[PDB]
Coordinates of C-alpha atoms in Angstrom, one line a residue:
Chain A
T1 CA -0.1 -0.1 0.0
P2 CA 1.5 3.6 -0.9
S3 CA 1.0 4.3 2.7
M4 CA 3.5 1.6 3.8
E5 CA 5.6 2.9 0.6
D6 CA 5.7 6.4 2.0
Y7 CA 7.1 4.8 5.3
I8 CA 9.8 2.1 3.6
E9 CA 11.3 5.3 1.8
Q10 CA 11.9 7.3 4.5
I11 CA 12.9 4.7 6.6
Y12 CA 15.4 3.3 3.8
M13 CA 16.3 7.3 3.4
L14 CA 17.4 7.7 6.8
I15 CA 19.4 4.4 6.9
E16 CA 21.0 5.1 4.1
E17 CA 22.4 8.5 5.3
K18 CA 22.3 7.9 9.7
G19 CA 22.7 3.9 10.1
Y20 CA 19.0 3.7 12.4
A21 CA 15.9 5.4 11.8
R22 CA 14.7 7.2 15.0
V23 CA 10.9 7.3 15.5
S24 CA 10.9 10.9 15.8
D25 CA 12.7 11.2 12.2
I26 CA 10.0 9.1 10.8
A27 CA 7.5 11.6 12.7
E28 CA 8.8 15.0 11.1
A29 CA 10.0 13.8 8.0
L30 CA 6.7 12.7 6.9
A31 CA 4.6 16.0 8.5
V32 CA 2.3 13.3 10.8
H33 CA 2.1 13.2 14.4
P34 CA 4.4 10.8 15.7
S35 CA 1.3 8.9 17.5
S36 CA 0.1 7.2 14.0
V37 CA 4.0 6.4 13.1
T38 CA 3.8 4.6 16.1
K39 CA 0.3 2.5 15.2
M40 CA 2.4 1.7 11.3
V41 CA 5.8 1.4 12.8
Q42 CA 4.9 -1.9 14.6
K43 CA 2.2 -2.5 11.7
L44 CA 5.4 -2.8 9.1
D45 CA 7.1 -4.5 12.1
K46 CA 4.3 -7.1 12.2
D47 CA 4.2 -7.9 8.1
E48 CA 7.6 -8.3 8.4
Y49 CA 9.5 -5.1 7.1
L50 CA 10.8 -3.6 9.7
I51 CA 11.9 -4.7 13.1
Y52 CA 10.9 -1.9 15.5
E53 CA 13.6 -1.7 18.8
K54 CA 12.9 0.9 21.3
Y55 CA 16.2 3.5 22.2
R56 CA 17.7 1.9 19.2
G57 CA 15.9 3.0 16.1
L58 CA 14.4 1.3 13.0
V59 CA 15.9 -1.6 11.1
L60 CA 14.5 -2.8 7.3
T61 CA 14.1 -6.8 7.0
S62 CA 15.5 -8.3 3.7
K63 CA 12.0 -7.7 2.6
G64 CA 12.2 -4.0 3.3
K65 CA 15.5 -4.1 2.1
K66 CA 13.8 -4.9 -1.2
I67 CA 11.5 -2.7 -1.4
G68 CA 12.6 0.3 -0.1
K69 CA 15.7 0.1 -2.6
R70 CA 13.3 -0.2 -5.2
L71 CA 11.0 2.9 -4.1
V72 CA 14.0 4.9 -3.5
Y73 CA 15.4 4.7 -7.0
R74 CA 12.9 5.4 -8.9
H75 CA 11.6 8.2 -6.1
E76 CA 15.5 9.7 -7.0
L77 CA 14.9 9.2 -10.8
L78 CA 11.9 11.0 -10.6
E79 CA 13.7 13.5 -8.8
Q80 CA 16.8 13.6 -10.9
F81 CA 14.3 13.9 -14.2
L82 CA 12.3 17.1 -12.7
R83 CA 15.6 18.8 -11.9
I84 CA 17.0 18.0 -15.7
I85 CA 13.8 19.3 -17.6
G86 CA 14.1 22.5 -15.0
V87 CA 11.8 22.4 -12.7
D88 CA 11.9 24.6 -9.2
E89 CA 13.9 23.1 -6.4
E90 CA 11.2 23.6 -4.3
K91 CA 8.7 22.1 -6.0
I92 CA 10.6 18.7 -6.9
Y93 CA 9.8 17.1 -3.8
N94 CA 5.8 17.2 -3.8
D95 CA 5.4 16.8 -7.5
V96 CA 7.3 13.2 -7.1
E97 CA 5.5 11.8 -4.0
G98 CA 2.7 12.4 -6.0
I99 CA 2.9 10.1 -9.7
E100 CA 5.8 8.1 -8.1
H101 CA 2.8 5.6 -7.5
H102 CA 1.1 6.2 -10.7
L103 CA 3.5 5.6 -13.1
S104 CA 4.6 2.1 -14.8
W105 CA 7.9 0.9 -14.9
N106 CA 7.9 1.0 -18.2
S107 CA 7.7 4.9 -17.9
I108 CA 10.0 4.9 -15.2
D109 CA 12.2 2.7 -17.3
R110 CA 11.9 4.9 -20.4
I111 CA 12.9 8.3 -18.2
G112 CA 15.8 6.7 -17.3
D113 CA 17.3 6.6 -20.6
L114 CA 15.6 10.2 -20.8
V115 CA 18.2 10.4 -18.0
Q116 CA 20.7 9.0 -19.4
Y117 CA 20.4 11.0 -22.5
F118 CA 21.1 14.6 -20.8
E119 CA 23.9 13.1 -18.3
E120 CA 25.6 11.6 -20.8
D121 CA 26.0 15.1 -22.5
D122 CA 26.1 18.1 -20.5
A123 CA 27.0 20.3 -23.6
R124 CA 22.8 19.2 -24.1
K125 CA 21.9 20.9 -21.1
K126 CA 22.1 23.8 -23.0
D127 CA 19.9 24.0 -25.3
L128 CA 17.1 22.7 -23.1
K129 CA 18.6 25.8 -20.8
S130 CA 17.4 28.2 -23.6
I131 CA 14.3 27.4 -24.3
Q132 CA 13.0 29.0 -21.8
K133 CA 11.9 32.3 -23.8
Chain B
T1 CA -12.6 18.1 -8.2
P2 CA -10.6 15.1 -10.1
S3 CA -13.5 13.7 -10.5
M4 CA -15.6 16.2 -12.4
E5 CA -12.1 16.9 -14.4
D6 CA -12.0 13.5 -16.7
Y7 CA -15.7 14.1 -17.1
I8 CA -14.6 17.5 -18.4
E9 CA -12.0 16.4 -20.6
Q10 CA -14.0 13.1 -21.8
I11 CA -16.8 15.8 -22.8
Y12 CA -14.3 18.5 -24.5
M13 CA -12.7 15.6 -26.6
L14 CA -16.1 14.0 -27.6
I15 CA -17.0 17.4 -28.5
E16 CA -14.0 18.6 -30.7
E17 CA -14.5 15.8 -32.6
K18 CA -18.1 15.0 -33.0
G19 CA -19.5 18.3 -32.1
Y20 CA -21.7 16.8 -29.6
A21 CA -21.7 14.3 -26.3
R22 CA -24.1 11.5 -26.4
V23 CA -24.7 9.9 -22.7
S24 CA -23.7 6.7 -23.5
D25 CA -20.8 7.5 -25.0
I26 CA -19.3 8.9 -22.1
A27 CA -20.2 5.6 -20.3
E28 CA -18.2 3.8 -22.4
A29 CA -15.1 6.1 -22.3
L30 CA -14.9 6.1 -19.1
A31 CA -15.7 2.2 -18.3
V32 CA -18.1 3.9 -15.5
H33 CA -22.2 2.6 -15.9
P34 CA -24.2 5.2 -17.3
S35 CA -26.4 5.1 -14.5
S36 CA -23.3 6.9 -12.6
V37 CA -22.6 9.1 -15.4
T38 CA -26.3 10.8 -15.5
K39 CA -26.3 11.5 -11.7
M40 CA -22.7 13.6 -12.5
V41 CA -24.1 14.9 -16.0
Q42 CA -27.0 16.4 -14.2
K43 CA -24.6 17.8 -11.1
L44 CA -22.6 19.4 -13.7
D45 CA -25.0 20.7 -15.2
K46 CA -26.1 22.4 -11.7
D47 CA -22.6 23.7 -11.2
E48 CA -22.7 25.5 -14.3
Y49 CA -20.0 23.5 -16.5
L50 CA -22.6 21.8 -18.9
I51 CA -26.0 21.8 -20.4
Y52 CA -27.3 18.1 -20.3
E53 CA -30.4 18.3 -23.1
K54 CA -31.6 14.7 -23.8
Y55 CA -31.8 13.3 -27.7
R56 CA -29.4 16.7 -27.7
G57 CA -26.5 15.2 -26.4
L58 CA -24.1 17.6 -24.0
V59 CA -22.7 21.3 -24.3
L60 CA -19.7 22.5 -22.0
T61 CA -20.5 26.4 -21.4
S62 CA -18.1 29.4 -21.0
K63 CA -17.1 27.2 -17.9
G64 CA -16.6 24.7 -18.9
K65 CA -14.9 25.6 -22.2
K66 CA -12.1 27.2 -19.8
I67 CA -11.4 24.3 -18.0
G68 CA -12.0 21.3 -21.1
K69 CA -9.6 23.5 -23.1
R70 CA -6.8 23.0 -20.4
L71 CA -7.3 19.7 -18.9
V72 CA -7.0 18.2 -22.3
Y73 CA -4.0 20.4 -23.2
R74 CA -1.9 18.8 -20.1
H75 CA -3.2 15.4 -20.9
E76 CA -2.3 15.7 -24.8
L77 CA 0.9 16.9 -23.5
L78 CA 2.0 14.5 -21.3
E79 CA 0.3 11.9 -23.8
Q80 CA 3.1 13.6 -26.3
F81 CA 5.6 13.2 -23.9
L82 CA 5.3 9.3 -23.0
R83 CA 5.2 9.0 -26.8
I84 CA 8.2 10.8 -27.3
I85 CA 10.5 8.9 -24.4
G86 CA 9.2 5.7 -26.0
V87 CA 6.4 4.3 -23.6
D88 CA 4.2 1.6 -25.0
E89 CA 1.1 2.9 -26.7
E90 CA -0.9 0.7 -24.7
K91 CA 0.3 2.1 -21.0
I92 CA 0.1 5.8 -22.2
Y93 CA -3.7 6.7 -21.3
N94 CA -3.5 4.6 -18.0
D95 CA -0.6 6.5 -16.8
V96 CA -1.6 9.9 -17.7
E97 CA -4.4 9.5 -16.2
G98 CA -2.7 8.7 -12.8
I99 CA -0.5 11.9 -13.2
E100 CA -2.0 14.5 -15.1
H101 CA -3.8 15.9 -11.8
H102 CA -0.8 15.4 -9.8
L103 CA 1.9 17.3 -11.3
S104 CA 2.4 21.0 -10.8
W105 CA 2.2 23.9 -13.6
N106 CA 5.6 24.4 -14.0
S107 CA 6.3 20.8 -14.3
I108 CA 3.5 21.0 -16.9
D109 CA 5.5 23.6 -18.4
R110 CA 9.0 22.3 -18.5
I111 CA 7.9 18.9 -19.9
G112 CA 6.8 21.3 -22.7
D113 CA 10.2 22.4 -23.5
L114 CA 10.9 19.2 -23.3
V115 CA 8.4 18.2 -26.1
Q116 CA 9.3 21.4 -27.9
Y117 CA 12.8 20.4 -27.9
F118 CA 12.6 17.2 -29.8
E119 CA 10.3 17.9 -32.2
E120 CA 12.4 21.1 -33.5
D121 CA 14.9 18.3 -34.2
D122 CA 13.6 14.5 -35.4
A123 CA 17.4 14.1 -35.9
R124 CA 17.2 13.8 -32.2
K125 CA 14.6 11.6 -31.3
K126 CA 17.5 9.5 -32.9
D127 CA 19.9 9.0 -30.6
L128 CA 16.7 8.8 -27.4
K129 CA 15.8 5.8 -29.7
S130 CA 19.5 3.8 -29.5
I131 CA 19.9 4.1 -25.5
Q132 CA 17.4 1.0 -25.6
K133 CA 19.9 -1.3 -25.3

């Protein structure tokens, strides 16, 4: 479920930078009260995505690492994509959040080629960054 | 509302090709039973988007033409965009439906430049259509 996914994403990201994931970290990295976080976080534990250990933060399982890595990849790519085409830095997150669960892997794949296409030649970020006239 | 919007889109499109918009046309161009269509179609009439005249199809107002033209433009563009980057023809509609209500006008605008960028040189649809290796 998209609810569960946002959390897996946020947990994986917190892990990748920090090592662990506190509860408060989730609470404010989603903007939802820690009251709700607690309910979901023990739910996701019961479903074998994570393991909630108080004082000790939050650890993904093999099943959490599988999904987290996936979710974060497309998220980062869609974010990378919007940056390339030239969208405001401050509008990227909100837009990617709202489209990431509504795109087929084929489209995710094609966008990948599109990002690869501009990255392969930074002397082509040029032409794009001139049509804004 | 996104519900109302899908209908405005579908009505505008039917008008643009046909002249009018029958009820059955809506019923099967959304896949939702004509029972629901009827309820919504008289609702949208009450809200001054259209005018429902039996036997005589469905006519947008100035307020319907304003929104319809807008909705269809981004829809067509997002559809155009997915085609350019190389997505399966059969996956385009479903994907555009699910992302069109979740993208900012800034992103819609930037994608516009992106489409303009490839259209301006069909000798650049080339490189893209070779990274699929």
